[PDB]
């Protein structure tokens, strides 16, 4: 008999309310994504996937299918190999090319082949087992998809997030990660960093004490417990939609899937 724990918190929720990205933040949008998304004229938006959203998946898949064909070399052309296992020559090709010079670093720098792999993601799974968080006198699910968990010499684990694109590195993100981290891998030494398969640039290792993880913690119990909040005003009247996630329209509407249904949007 154990209630059903709707609270949750992950680093997507979290940038939907705090946003280098913040000139498109619009607190409407996760009215859309997030309260409204059942009403048909908003889900017929959602079912359309995006082109970074794309390259980011192929990318994925593409390291794990290159990185599994090279564990024994059978002498053939790892990247063609990878590219028809990806169907690239069925993509658009901006996509294709931009996954093919991911698939050309990776090639110049394997930087797996050596290496004791603990989880590497093919990129199509769902969503991860959440785990189950009692903070304070708030109990949530806290969700976090780790795309490449490394373990080194001395045993420390070496969490990689793979990023493409333009896009500047979010460090909340790497200590959401070390957090779940400490709940997935318990009494085990964890660092976090971020390397862009497009153009090889990586952050720094990044570590977190016990106590700036207990602190981030809150800060997620925090926002699970304000997101529930969102949808209960929202759901008790419906009309307090725009009180509850105020429009932000401008540059913000040029990248939103709700444009052609938003009263706002420009
Ligand atoms: S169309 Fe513009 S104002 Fe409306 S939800 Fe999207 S970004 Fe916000």
Redesign the pocket.
Known sequence: SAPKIWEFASYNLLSLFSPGLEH?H?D??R??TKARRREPQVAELLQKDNIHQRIGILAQRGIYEFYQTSLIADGKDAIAQTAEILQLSQEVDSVRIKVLQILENYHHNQFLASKKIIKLSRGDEGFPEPILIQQGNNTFKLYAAMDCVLQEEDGTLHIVDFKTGKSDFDRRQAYIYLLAASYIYPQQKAVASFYNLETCQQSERIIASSSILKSFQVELSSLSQRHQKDLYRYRRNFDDFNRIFP????V??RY????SI?????
């Not at 939103?256 to 444009?259: G, L, P, Q, V």
């Not at 938003?262 to 420009?266: D, G």
């Open positions: 498109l619009c409407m949008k009215g859309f429009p932000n329209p401008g913000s509407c939103c899937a709700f444009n938003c009263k706002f949007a420009m």
